[PDB]
Amino acid sequence: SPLRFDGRVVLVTGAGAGLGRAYALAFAERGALVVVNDLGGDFKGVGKGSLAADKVVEEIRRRGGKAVANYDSVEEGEKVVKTALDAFGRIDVVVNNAGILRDRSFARISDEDWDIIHRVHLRGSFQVTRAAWEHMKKQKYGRIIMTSSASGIYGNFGQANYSAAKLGLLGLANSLAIEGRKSNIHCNTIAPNAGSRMTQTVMPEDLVEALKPEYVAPLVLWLCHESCEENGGLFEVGAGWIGKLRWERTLGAIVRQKNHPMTPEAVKANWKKICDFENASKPQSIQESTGSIIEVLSKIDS
Amino acid sequence: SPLRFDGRVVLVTGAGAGLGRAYALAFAERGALVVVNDLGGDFKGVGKGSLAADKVVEEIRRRGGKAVANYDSVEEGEKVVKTALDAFGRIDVVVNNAGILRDRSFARISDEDWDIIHRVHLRGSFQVTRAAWEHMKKQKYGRIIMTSSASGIYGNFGQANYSAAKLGLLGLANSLAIEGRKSNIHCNTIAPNAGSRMTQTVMPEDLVEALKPEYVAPLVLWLCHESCEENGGLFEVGAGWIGKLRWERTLGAIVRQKNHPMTPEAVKANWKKICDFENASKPQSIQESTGSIIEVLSKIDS
Ligand SMILES: NC(=O)c1ccc[n+]([C@@H]2O[C@H](COP(=O)([O-])OP(=O)(O)OC[C@H]3O[C@@H](n4cnc5c(N)ncnc54)[C@H](O)[C@@H]3O)[C@@H](O)[C@H]2O)c1
Ligand SMILES: NC(=O)c1ccc[n+]([C@@H]2O[C@H](COP(=O)([O-])OP(=O)(O)OC[C@H]3O[C@@H](n4cnc5c(N)ncnc54)[C@H](O)[C@@H]3O)[C@@H](O)[C@H]2O)c1
């Protein structure tokens, strides 16, 4: 049976171009009432305009879908979610996608370069999501997506500001998944790969064209569907492929011995064992890691 | 041979109490010229005083080490680093440890709760580290620690603000590791467990006493030593135990077929495969993930 969104209010931030545009179209085609948010500025965080969101709303309506435009920056997240409440009377799905770039080597990152990346990516997603949250709890339904990146997950030369903001988003998502669960609110995180104005600088023209944002949209739609049970997952996605990430944790070493001072010399001596991933565990929660560490105290005293 | 720090200028932020105090004392005992930074306020980010830093400087001096105090907030990271430059003429090791808590359910996190946590933890470590960076590069020597948390790595109810900031720090560490490497500048991240004023609220009294910050200091000193080769690692640590964390990534599923639109139905139908961690890879860099995703384009065309 086809996965539909009839009667679901779906907000996509940064929906004027690239991935967000692809999301907004794909949702509206499946019957979603779509809020198309876009500030309408450039990819470095300069400017503002109605045109970017208005062009997408028009496209959606031409294709026989339902959509309204929002022109506020995600920094004003309350105002963004207000459009959903005014136009459609509810908010069911939030796709946090809005983003910009300020690439620079570390010493060269200005205060402004840091703050603008963090206000848009991380604080922006927070603002938007907090605005939707109590509505989702009262309804007992929500589906939220955070947009991280490979540069956050792995690190990347010249992108310390951006990678900090992007992995911060994952940190946010880890906690939302926990707080939303009992209320049927899910939060999941994606690390997408797509040709766009943002990636034009780093990719050859033929790659930009080939790595289509419509290769990411099907994942977003699934993770945002009522029938989806995935919660608190992190996904890498592009080209038509999808994979999932998780932490693994070494068995490690108990370096401290009863009645003896723990020294950095014992850490150094035990370094290979500390870093050995053979039979690594797959920790599921804070309780699990925190609990096993605390039980180390009694193991030493035994 | 004992691991010494004679002639190394070591800055510890938030060194007035808890883990930072334990690091400062441990460093100074091994000959380090220590800058003891502390704002001297409470654990929720209220207040300011010279007492916190002064106490620790005098304890170090009483034990026969060398130390000077700095009283600025890490928000003023240039001023904190300037103390090392003024007192000792260089900066060699930076332990970003300063932090506060603003626990609250998600809907209840105010703008001020968010901004203060992010200013201190994330923007603070950035300001401090950015101030040291060019000095480290010209010297061709640096050792940096970021302090994350299990709540950032796993998520935790009522800590969405903090967990965002704490995993943002890891994101920052991932990129610094890459940028610093060729200059003998290492950055590593720890997720510690220690009894302190911060953890008194969630742990019983006997546990606070048992989970000593002195069990974490030996890892920090090793990771900050000149003979340490570890760079870009993430470690969980407490009770006398240490472990290391890494990402694993499913082989995943190519769900797009040549000449057929990619659908959310095909994502759904392949969900088990996408989520299956059997023979999961262990991705080491952005190149590795990005490269293999791009390669999927030609695989579909073939
Ligand atoms: N494209 C990739 O390969 C890639 C990789 C990793 C992460 N990302 C992330 O995915 C998201 C989508 O990016 P894209 O590649 O489609 O870039 P894009 O520039 O094509 O589109 C981003 C959209 O966000 C909008 N935006 C920027 N600031 C805004 C603000 N304050 N308020 C509202 N809208 C704002 C832009 O106007 C634009 O419409 C971004 O968060 C980006 O950082 C993309
Ligand atoms: N104790 C744990 O189990 C645990 C777990 C995870 C993370 N952490 C992190 O470890 C670090 C230290 O934790 P702790 O348990 O020792 O806490 P603590 O409160 O005992 O010590 C924190 C110190 O940081 C200082 N500080 C706060 N804001 C500052 C600022 N703006 N500038 C300079 N100093 C400032 C405080 O004055 C205090 O002395 C924090 O980043 C904390 O978030 C601790």
Question: What 3-state class would DSSP assign to A288?
Answer: helix
SS (H, E, C) B23-73: HHHHHHHCCCEEEEECCCCCCCCCCCCCHHHHHHHHHHHHCCCEEEEECCC
Q: Ligand 2 test: best mutation among B11, B12, B13, B19, most atoms within 8 Å of CB?
A: B19
Q: Which residue has tokens 């023209």?
A: A205
Which residues, other chains included, contact B112 with Cβ-Cβ below 8 Å and sequence gap of 6+?
none
Q: How far apart are CA B294 and CA A211, in angstroms?
A: 8
Q: Which atom of ligand 1 is nearest to the CA of A121?
A: 41
Beta-bridge partner residues of A246: B248
Query: B234-238 and B241-249 as β-strands: parallel, antiparallel, unpaired?
Result: antiparallel
- Which strand (E) or helix (H) includes residue A68? strand A66-70
* CA nearest neighbour of A131 among A142, A121, A118: A142
CA separation, residue B80 to residues A164, A216, A234, B10 (Å): 22, 44, 37, 12
Chain B residues with CB under 8 Å of A3 CB are 264-265, 268
Chain A residues with CB under 8 Å of B167 CB are 167-168, 170-171, 174
* CA nearest neighbour of B166 among A121, A234, A172, A128: A172
Q: How far apart are CA B12 and CA B18, in angstroms?
A: 12
CA of B279 to the centre of ligand 2 (A): 39
CA of A202 to the centre of ligand 1 (A): 15
Q: Which residue has tokens 């004679």?
A: B6
Q: How many CB pairs under 8 A join A and B?
A: 350
- How many alpha carbons lie under 13 Å from residue A224 in its C-beta half-sphere? 32
Q: Are B109 and B76 in contact (CB under 8 A)?
A: no
Q: How far apart are CA B250 and CA B278, in angstroms?
A: 7
> What does CATH list as the number for A245-302?
1.10.287.4290
Tokens of B56: 């620790």
CA separation, residue B176 to residues A43, A282, B159, B169, B235 (Å): 24, 27, 26, 11, 16
Task: Determine if residue A161 is left, alpha or beta; phi over 0 gives left, psi from -120 to 50 gives alpha, anything else beta.
Answer: alpha
Q: Are A33 and A88 in contact (CB under 8 A)?
A: yes
DSSP per-residue letters across A90-148 = ---EEEE---------GGG--HHHHHHHHHHHHHHHHHHHHHHHHHHHHHT-EEEEEE-
**Which member of A71, A154, A162, A215 is catalytic?**
A162
Q: How far apart are CA A162 and CA A159, in angstroms?
A: 5
- How many alpha carbons lie under 13 Å from residue B98 in its C-beta half-sphere? 38
Which ligand lies nearest to the CA atom of residue A97 in the structure? 1
Inter-chain CB proximity A160 and B177 less than 8 Å: no
Chain A residues with CB under 8 Å of B285 CB are 154-155
DSSP B184: T
Experimental approach: X-ray
Q: Where are the beta strands (DSSP E) in chain B?
A: 9-12, 33-37, 66-70, 93-96, 142-147, 185-192, 234-238, 241-249, 253-254
Q: Are B37 and B70 in contact (CB under 8 A)?
A: yes
- Which strand (E) or helix (H) includes residue A236? strand A234-238
B94 CB neighbour count, 10 Å cutoff: 31
Q: Are B230 and B224 in contact (CB under 8 A)?
A: no
* Alpha-carbon distance B6 to nearest alpha carbon in chain A (angstroms): 15
Neighbour-count burial of B144, counting CB atoms closer than 10 A to its CB (0-12 exposed, 13-18 middle, 19+ buried):
buried
- Pick from B168, B225, B250: which is nearest to A264 by CB? B225
Q: How far apart are CA A75 and CA B51, in angstroms?
A: 38
Chain B residues with CB under 8 Å of A288 CB are 154
Which ligand lies nearest to the CA atom of residue B208 in the structure? 2
Q: Give the catalytic positions of B in this structure.
A: 162
> Ligand 2 within 6 A of B73 CB?
yes
Tokens of B82: 């300037």
Which residues, other chains included, contact B255 with Cβ-Cβ below 8 Å and sequence gap of 6+?
A218, A240, A241, A242, B262, B266, B267, B270, B274
CA of B169 to the centre of ligand 1 (A): 22
* Alpha-carbon distance A273 to nearest alpha carbon in chain B (angstroms): 9
Shortest CA distance from A286: residue in chain B? B154
Rg (CA), chain A: 22
Which residues, other chains included, contact A273 with Cβ-Cβ below 8 Å and sequence gap of 6+?
A252, A253
Separation of first and last alpha carbons in chain A: 58
DSSP B119: I
Q: Are A101 and A151 in contact (CB under 8 A)?
A: no
CATH superfamily of A1-244: NAD(P)-binding Rossmann-like Domain (3.40.50.720)
Q: Which atom of ligand 1 is nearest to the CA of A148?
A: 7
* CA nearest neighbour of A31 among A231, A225, A227: A225
Q: How far apart are CA A177 and CA A173, in angstroms?
A: 6
Shortest CA distance from B240: residue in chain A? A256
* Alpha-carbon distance A188 to nearest alpha carbon in chain B (angstroms): 12
- Pick from A152, A175, A252: which is nearest to B155 by CB? A175
Resolution in A: 2.2
Angle at A208 between CA B269 and CA A153, to 5 degrees: 65
Which residues, other chains included, contact B93 with Cβ-Cβ below 8 Å and sequence gap of 6+?
B5, B8, B9, B10, B11, B27, B32, B142, B143, B144, B224
Instruction: Compute φ and ψ for B203, nearest 5 degrees.
Output: -115, 140
* CA nearest neighbour of A113 among A161, A72, A177: A161
Task: Determine if residue A203 is left, alpha or beta; phi over 0 gives left, psi from -120 to 50 gives alpha, anything else beta.
Answer: beta
| Type of residue numbered A260 | H
DSSP B74: G
Q: How far apart are CA A70 and CA A98, in angstroms?
A: 13
CA of B60 to the centre of ligand 1 (A): 50
* Alpha-carbon distance B236 to nearest alpha carbon in chain A (angstroms): 9
Tokens of B28: 């100074």
Which residues, other chains included, contact A167 with Cβ-Cβ below 8 Å and sequence gap of 6+?
A148, A152, A153, B167, B168, B170, B171, B174
Q: Which residue has tokens 């952005």?
A: B286
Residue ranges of domains in chain B: 1-244, 245-302
